[PDB]
Design a binder for these strands. Structure first.
Ligand SMILES: [Mg+2]
Ligand SMILES: [Zn+2]
Ligand SMILES: [Zn+2]
Lengths: 49, 492, 471, 44, 50, 199, 100, 98, 93, 204
DNA sequence: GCCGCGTCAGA
DNA sequence: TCTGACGCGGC
DNA sequence: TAGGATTTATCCGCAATGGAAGCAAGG
DNA sequence: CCTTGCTTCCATTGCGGATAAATCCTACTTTTTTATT
């Protein structure tokens, strides 16, 4: 439970649902981040990707 | 006498030319107010601090203004007294912010800065490669000090067995310590002046730009040491000063949550390992154990001074590295970059800007509510002045009611008082300009159009910050230097 | 070497150079420790202060100038036993001591023998060894000062000085005989003759306390230290052989707040303890015993230095018991225990549970990156509290001005007794007694006076500014 | 030729104002800002 | 450690006002700057104001 | 009633009178000359010394002690701070002022003319040199005048009478501090005719 | 000591305690504004040690310096809305108040 | 947002808030350079001494403001004392001189 | 430069003094400032502070960054006047 | 700067240096005992005491000499055990007792070693008769006019100890209660702790 | 003497 | 990351 | 990742005295 | 208009069990680990 609840509560990829539209929600759920564990960082990368 | 004048002169915060140097062990003790002997912080039940711990009223002044810890002295009668039950002295708790403590390290310990700052001060002072010094600090290998009447250079390093058969040869007239104790013996037994003259002559004679460059570097450091008057042996800590507890606070949060500063954990592991080293030394432990203890104590002190220049001790239960004193001074978000510069400022507001193109070049539209908050003390003063309020407390109630008189008073204290407007990325000096405010409804700051290009402003959501110059000098500077009607030409 | 900085690596590398040892080698090493320790016992037993002190201490506990169990821990081959054995010891001691006039040394030897029967506490034994040490230190300061004086002021070589001064150090044969040889340093032996002779005399005195020649006590204590060194080297061998056991046990307790190395260090402490207290004669292999002390010391130290806000070990035992019970409950009931359900599984009064539940929350760092790891941590959200609002400072200042001008109203006597009655603009406020005692009318008048001034103030047109200045 | 500073004559005049520069004016800062204030509008 | 929590819900009816940000759908942002009276707005032949 | 056996101009008696006026308590003042002091004084004070006080059961010599007793019995208004360190420093100043400058008054009066005027120069330079002190805080290291002023201001009062006058700079702060204390009403109400002739 | 949620809040006029129900919570439907007490809550407090002048105040006016500090929950400034819901959770064991 | 005075931080004594009286605006480096580019020394001083850090000067300033007398006593920013203590807490002896 | 203005004022005291101008990038040119506070507040702090410590440096404050850190009147602009007067009060009574 | 645990520049045998030491013991306050050579204080503390006088006390910012001042400072700073009465009459009375004792007998102790043998025997007999006169009062309260160890005793003990140095063995009317009083104050733990080696030397 | 390489600071 | 500087070392 | 068993120290509630009200009676 | 003086009634520090806290000690055997973008 520690591992799972950690992933779900305090993670870069678990985010407060952006909820002020139907559009905002439905676009939050179709988001494709390249960050998060095992990804890039906003300062590491990088003019190319 | 004139010594009274010398003293009253020392009781003066007007100075010049702040100095810096190394700290002798005796000086470090002098700063202190007492020794920290326990890793305890507070009492888990009645949160008053323990005795002689990282938060100790007897060492770092009282917790509550003008009363001892044991509550025996609260009355105003006793205001300089030292209670006897708790050794606390009844003064203002702000002294909890300036008194430093100290720890007596059971074994000397190298100050990591003067060891791992890349031109190794210790190294190039001893003319010993950093690799071999570290070999000595971790008790990997002995080092001769005063070989004496034998074939042993003063700094020739031996491994364990080499020193063994050395002893087998000569049980004496030859000294080889191991660990930071040895490095301290070397640094202390040195001679800056003799070696300075010798190296000077060697520099005079030999001609090989690598050797002459290293030589002038070393002669530079040596003459620097003899001019500064700092003893090199001080680069080895024996007393470790501890920070005032108010600057590493253990503030409580609502609901049992306590917020603490990492320095508490770093200090605590230092103190624990120091106490265990004392206890081991008393127990007469196997030398391997004592060596391991001295090693890990050195590791703790390094983590405290500069966490990261080694195996990077992270905090308990939180997988973040701890934040050490170096990490507080050094750092863009660290103090000296976030503190002493770029400070948060009172009397200041922020809001979204709009156009308002009816203004004159020296005016800005200021929302009424914002102004009523920015100038509140000016308004308190003016209200008490015109008698409309008996006391400052009455005036506070008035401006909370927003009685229709405070608006007249506000239009009065605003009359000629210019305010500063600053847009977010202040690229150049037109990023801050002074304006005279026009009291305005709504909540948007109305900015003259002609200055927009200066601020590089857009009315597409950009916000500006307002500051209120207080003193007469500041108002006159704003009117004469930073008024908008003076910046028409660019200084570029 | 791989130029490694990890102390874990260095320690593990350094501990493996010693290898383990068999279960019978353990018996051998234990036998060695026993050799050394019983030898130091006997070497003390020769020193008569030992036996005189033991008999004195039994006679003192028989007058309760000491305690029962602090004098013995059994006999190697009970009050009746204690009295009969101390009477036997008194018998041996009196029949050996007064016979100094040789049979003296052998009789004190037999007294040493009977003393070897006993096992006192390590505490009074520590008293004994400390006495031995202070005696040796008397010998030490004596020799040091004496040789310093008689080869520095006297300028004698060291060899010719020691081959006569040493050995007796109570009889002055060296003193007269050297001058009889008529050497220049023998002549200068007149210079510090007095100080050195009086120091030698104090040495005589101490010897009289010992009854044995400084030569004899020196031999005694040299034998003593030899036995002790033997014991220490044997202990070293055992500890360096079981360091691996310590590593094994410590491994378990890793992530409870202490680094791996702090754990193994506390373990090593526990191991030295076990080695000290370990008896092989029980035929129990050493690890069987030492495991207890190691686990014990590690758990105790985890309790003592893991949390920032230390909680005493009984409370940590309670918290751990609660966690054990809560795990059982959670995994059995499935959902969760509520504090009532716990208090049922435990027997606590259902409120002690809540106290314990409040304790164990640990202090969160003032540097945890606040949301999204932004340019800000928790530390910059904790406002100060001790300060007073600059508004409140101004209010206080104006209040002082106000009270001052109100008190201007009342006559001098009234404002005086008022300012003195509370603490206005002076040091501690005084009780009315002192107000009178300085006010020449030690009377209940003063309290009526205070009340009258309070009225005359609270009266309109004087109060009304303060009923307007109501705050 | 000045030590620790520059003479108001070696510097020049250019300014918001239009006359020769006034003593005590901090030219180094406004120079750093004039050079770096562009830039974050045109790389290349 | 807590005894009882009371949560209160406020409903606010925020009207538009000078300063609020408005935007079409093609990245034409903008901060409204004047609430103009009706009789000032431009208007076509049928008198409908914009 | 408390009686004070004051000296006509004895600076000690001056201080005692000043603190009496400061606490402002009634007292049967008695001027005394050291030739034929009143019989009662010699009946009570074996030293036969002035100033000297009685309070209906208690007698004290040595003005320092007297001031301490007064300030300890008649609190309002306080003349020694609370902080034992501050009290200690004030006591040290009360002692040093005396030890150094009363034994200069004693040269200028009870010594030869050469010693008199050499010490006059010495004292003058001392006062002018420490003058910047009073230039910061109102009174002698305080915000409210205290027993150190009771010690200091009397000697400062008799300065023309010692014929010691002031240079340019030091006189500024000297006169500032003077009018500070020279105006203080307790100073005046404490004065006698025997003194004003000096100033 | 525990904290209380009653409407017994010192020195706030019945203009302030107007909209609190008898149990200290606000009435549903209340149009509130900045500063108004939503939930009146007092916390125990001690060790006053007030300055001499405040002591003289309490003397001349008999104002008993109460021991319960005010810590009620009030509307943040600038926001002026309607209360549309009030939820009350209580740790079990604690006796419920009328409103709960 | 806007504030005149409010709560202050704990270790450094500078403004901060979340309680609808937030901190003041950050007067970061670039603004300091702007004030240096003007000759505005007094504005800058009161900006980083009395408006922010000087724990005693700021209250003296408040009392002066309400008294109709606009003047400032500079003292020394508390953040600087903190920096001193954190340097001294290394092995380094840093001190004001005179 | 001032060395030479002097040792050429007195001509007997120095008969020789020569150098070569040297150029550093802005970063390095800030490292090598006289005042360790100006430097340590901008560059790497550990290195600057270590070096200044083992040299016993002394920082006259002579500058804008320094006078801002410690929070006193900047020696430029409106502050200039004051600072002038101050250094006249010093180097004198 | 000013250092540490509050050292004291105690003369090794100076009477006032002993007064303050007795006090410090009575407050039980940790401190250092700095010694001066015999009469010239270490040439470096003159950086503190322009009078170059001992005993001198320093707590990290505060220098004090003139033992009376120092003892009053300690009694106020460390208020327990109280070493002075609590009432103004008694406090002033004790201050006067100390003033009289000093100005009468310490001057005589100084003249004894400071004049010819004429003054020596004269002042010796003088203080002897004076003590035998004050004698009957000693019996009243366990200590000198006080039911508990008061600061005035810290004026008596340092003198009574130094009688051997002046050669007066108490015989005659009053040499009973006086020996009993020296028994009380001399055997007092704090007083023992006050004693330096040289201070014990004057006794057997 | 000259080139490759590890180490750190900084965005 | 990456870029640069640079001790530090190998050729 | 125990726990009994021992031993002590700290705290919480109880009551005894000194200060301050409260009449209550002469100046 | 006063001006003392006698009851009385409440904070304040010895003075007490109840709990918290610290110490000590265990016996089949158990032996190089861990720890990781
Ligand atoms: Mg924009
Ligand atoms: Zn206390
Ligand atoms: Zn020029």
């Amino acid at each position: 439970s520690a591992a799972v609840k950690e992933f779900f509560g305090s993670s870069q990829l678990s985010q407060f649902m952006d909820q002020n539209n139907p559009l905002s929600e439905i676009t939050h759920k179709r988001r494709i981040s390249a960050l998060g564990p095992g990804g890039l960082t906003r300062e590491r990368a990088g003019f190319e990707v | 006498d004139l010594l009274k004048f010398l003293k009253a002169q020392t009781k003066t915060e007007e100075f010049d030319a702040i100095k810096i140097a190394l700290a002798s062990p005796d000086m470090i003790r002098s700063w202190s107010f007492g020794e920290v002997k326990k890793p305890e912080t507070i009492n888990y039940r009645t949160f008053k601090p323990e005795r002689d711990g990282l938060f100790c009223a007897r060492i770092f002044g009282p917790v509550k203004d003008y009363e001892c810890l044991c509550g025996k002295y609260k009355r105003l009668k006793h205001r300089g007294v030292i209670c006897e039950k708790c050794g606390v002295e009844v003064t203002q708790t702000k002294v909890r912010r300036e008194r430093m403590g100290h720890i007596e390290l059971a074994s000397p310990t190298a100050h990591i800065w003067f060891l791992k700052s890349l031109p190794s001060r210790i190294g190039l002072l001893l003319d010993m490669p950093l690799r071999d010094i570290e070999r000595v600090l971790y008790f990997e290998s002995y080092v001769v000090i005063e070989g004496g009447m034998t074939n042993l250079e003063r700094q020739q390093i031996l491994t364990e067995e080499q020193y063994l058969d050395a002893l087998e040869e000569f049980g004496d007239e030859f000294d080889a310590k191991m660990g930071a104790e040895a490095i301290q013996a070397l640094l202390k037994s040195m001679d800056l002046e003799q070696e300075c003259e010798q190296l000077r002559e060697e520099l005079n004679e030999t001609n090989s730009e690598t050797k002459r460059k290293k030589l002038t570097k070393r002669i530079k450091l040596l003459e620097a040491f003899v001019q500064s008057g700092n003893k090199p042996e001080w680069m080895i800590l024996t007393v470790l000063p501890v920070l005032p507890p108010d600057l590493r606070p253990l503030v409580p949060l609502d609901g049992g949550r306590f917020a603490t500063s990492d320095l508490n954990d770093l200090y605590r592991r230092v103190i624990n390992r120091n106490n265990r080293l004392k206890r081991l030394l008393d127990l007469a432990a196997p030398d391997i154990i004592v060596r391991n203890e001295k090693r890990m104590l050195q590791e703790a002190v390094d983590a405290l001074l500069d966490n990261g220049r080694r195996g990077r001790a992270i905090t308990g239960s939180n997988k973040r590295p701890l934040k050490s004193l170096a990490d507080m001074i050094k750092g863009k978000q660290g103090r000296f970059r976030q503190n002493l510069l770029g400070k948060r400022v009172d009397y200041s507001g922020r809001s979204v800007i709009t156009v308002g193109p009816y203004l004159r070049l020296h005016q800005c539209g200021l929302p009424k509510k914002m102004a009523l908050e920015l100038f509140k003390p000016f308004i308190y003063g003016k209200l008490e002045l015109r008698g409309l309020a008996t006391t400052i407390k009455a005036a506070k109630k008035m401006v909370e009611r927003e009685e229709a008189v405070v608006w007249d008073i506000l239009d009065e204290v605003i009359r000629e008082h210019p305010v500063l407007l600053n847009r977010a990325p202040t690229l150049h000096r037109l990023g801050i300009q002074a304006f005279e405010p026009v009291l305005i409804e709504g909540k948007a700051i109305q900015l003259h159009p002609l200055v927009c290009a200066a601020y590089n402003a857009d009315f597409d959501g950009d916000q500006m910050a307002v500051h209120v110059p207080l003193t007469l000098e500041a108002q006159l500077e704003a009117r004469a230097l930073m008024m908008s009607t003076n910046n028409i030409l660019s200084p570029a | 070497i791989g130029r490694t900085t990890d102390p874990v690596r260095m320690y593990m590398r350094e501990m493996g150079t010693v290898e383990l040892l068999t279960r019978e080698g353990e018996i051998d090493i234990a036998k060695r420790i026993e050799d050394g320790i019983n030898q130091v016992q006997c070497s003390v037993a020769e020193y008569p202060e030992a036996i005189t002190y033991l008999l004195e201490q039994y006679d003192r506990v028989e007058a309760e100038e000491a305690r029962l169990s602090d004098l013995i821990t059994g006999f190697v081959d009970d009050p009746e036993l204690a009295r009969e054995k101390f009477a036997e010891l008194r018998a041996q001691y009196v029949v050996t001591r007064d016979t100094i006039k040789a049979t003296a040394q052998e009789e004190i030897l037999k007294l040493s023998e009977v003393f070897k029967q006993f096992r006192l506490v390590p505490k009074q034994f520590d008293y004994l060894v400390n006495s031995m040490r202070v005696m040796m230190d008397r010998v030490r300061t004596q020799e040091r000062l004496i040789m310093k004086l008689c080869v520095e002021q006297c300028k004698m070589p060291k060899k010719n000085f020691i081959t006569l001064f040493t050995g007796n150090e109570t009889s002055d044969t060296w003193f007269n005989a050297a001058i009889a040889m008529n050497k220049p340093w023998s002549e200068k032996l007149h210079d510090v003759s007095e100080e050195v002779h009086r120091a030698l005399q104090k040495l005589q005195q101490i010897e009289e306390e010992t009854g044995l020649t400084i030569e004899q006590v020196k031999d005694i204590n040299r034998r003593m230290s030899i036995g002790e060194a033997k014991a220490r080297r044997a202990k070293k061998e055992m500890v360096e052989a079981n360091l691996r056991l310590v590593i094994s046990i410590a491994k378990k307790y890793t992530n409870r707040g202490l680094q791996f190395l702090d754990l193994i260090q506390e373990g090593n402490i526990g191991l030295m303890k076990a080695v000290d207290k370990f008896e092989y004669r029980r035929g129990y292999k050493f690890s069987t015993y030492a495991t207890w002390w190691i686990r014990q010391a590690i758990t105790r130290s985890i309790a003592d230095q893991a949390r920032t806000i230390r909680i005493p070990v009984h409370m940590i035992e309670t918290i751990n018991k609660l966690n054990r019970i809560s795990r059982q409950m959670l995994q059995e009931m499935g959902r969760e225990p509520t504090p009532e359900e716990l208090a049922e599984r435990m027997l606590m009064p259902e409120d002690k549970i809540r106290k314990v539940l409040k304790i164990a929350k640990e202090p969160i760092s003032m540097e945890t990156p606040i949301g999204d790891d932004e340019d800000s941590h928790l530390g910059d959200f904790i406002e100060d509290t001790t300060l007073e609002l600059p508004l409140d400072s101004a209010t206080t200042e104006s209040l002082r001005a106000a009270t001052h001008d109100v008190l201007a109203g009342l006559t001098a006597r009234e404002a005086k007794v008022l300012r003195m009655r509370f603490g206005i603009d002076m040091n501690t406020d005084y009780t009315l007694e002192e107000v009178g005692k300085q006010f020449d009318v030690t009377r209940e008048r003063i309290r009526q006076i205070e009340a009258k001034a309070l009225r005359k103030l609270r009266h309109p047109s004087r109060s009304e500014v303060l009923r307007s200045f109501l705050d | 030729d000045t030590d620790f500073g520059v003479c108001a004559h070696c510097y020049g005049r250019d300014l918001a104002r239009g006359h020769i520069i006034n003593k005590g004016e901090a030219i180094g800062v406004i120079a750093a800002q004039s050079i770096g204030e562009p830039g974050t509008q045109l790389t290349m | 450690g807590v005894l009882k929590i009371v949560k209160v819900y406020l409903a606010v009816k925020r009207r538009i006002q000078p300063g609020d940000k408005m935007a079409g759908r093609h990245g034409n942002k903008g901060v409204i700057s004047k609430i103009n009276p009706i009789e000032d707005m431009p208007y076509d032949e049928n008198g409908t104001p914009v | 009633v408390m009686t004070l056996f004051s000296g006509p101009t004895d600076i000690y008696s001056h201080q005692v009178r000043i603190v009496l006026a400061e606490k402002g308590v009634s007292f049967e003042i008695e001027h005394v000359e050291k030739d034929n002091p009143p019989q009662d004084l010699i009946d009570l004070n074996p030293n036969q010394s002035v100033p000297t006080l009685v309070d209906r059961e208690l007698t004290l010599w040595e003005s320092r002690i007297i001031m301490e007793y007064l300030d300890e019995r008649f609190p309002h208004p306080p003349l020694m701070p609370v902080y034992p360190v501050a009290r200690g420093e004030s006591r040290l100043y009360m002692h040093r002022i005396e030890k150094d400058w009363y034994t200069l008054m004693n040269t200028i009066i009870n010594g030869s003319a050469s010693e008199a005027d050499a010490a006059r120069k010495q004292l003058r330079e001392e006062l002018l040199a420490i003058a910047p002190v009073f230039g910061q805080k109102p009174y002698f290291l305080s915000d409210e005048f205290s027993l150190v002023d009771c010690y200091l201001a009397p000697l400062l009062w008799r300065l023309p009478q010692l014929g010691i006058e002031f240079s340019g700079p030091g006189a500024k702060e000297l006169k500032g501090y003077m009018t500070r204390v020279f105006e203080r009403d307790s100073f005046l109400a404490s004065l006698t005719e025997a003194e004003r002739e000096m100033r | 000591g525990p904290e209380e949620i009653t409407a017994d809040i010192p020195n706030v006029g019945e203009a302030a305690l107007s909209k609190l129900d008898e149990s200290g919570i606000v009435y549903i439907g209340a149009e509130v504004t900045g500063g108004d007490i939503l939930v009146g809550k007092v916390t125990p407090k001690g060790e006053t040690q007030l300055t001499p002048e405040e002591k003289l105040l309490r003397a001349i006016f008999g104002e008993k310096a109460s021991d319960v500090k005010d810590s009620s929950l009030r509307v943040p400034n600038g926001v002026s809305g309607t209360v549309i819901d009030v939820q009350v959770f209580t740790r079990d064991g604690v006796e419920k108040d009328k409103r709960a | 947002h806007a504030r005149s005075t409010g709560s202050y931080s704990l270790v450094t004594q500078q403004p901060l808030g979340g309680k609808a009286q937030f901190g003041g605006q950050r007067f970061g480096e670039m603004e300091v350079w702007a004030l240096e580019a003007y000759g505005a020394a007094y504005t800058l001083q009161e900006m980083l001494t009395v408006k922010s850090d000087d724990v005693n000067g700021r209250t003296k300033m408040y009392k002066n403001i309400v008294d109709g007398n606009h003047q400032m006593e500079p003292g020394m920013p508390e953040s600087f004392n903190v920096l001193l203590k954190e340097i001294r807490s290394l092995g380094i002896n840093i001190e004001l001189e005179d | 430069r001032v060395k030479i203005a002097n040792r050429e004022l007195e001509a007997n005291g120095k008969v020789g003094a020569t150098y070569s101008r040297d150029l550093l990038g802005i970063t390095k040119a800030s490292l090598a400032t006289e005042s360790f506070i100006s430097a340590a507040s901008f560059q790497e702090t550990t290195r600057v502070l270590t070096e200044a410590a083992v040299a016993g440096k002394r920082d006259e404050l002579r500058g804008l960054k320094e006078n801002v850190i410690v929070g006193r009147l900047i020696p430029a602009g409106t502050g200039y006047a004051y600072h002038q007067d101050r250094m006249r009060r010093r180097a004198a009574g």
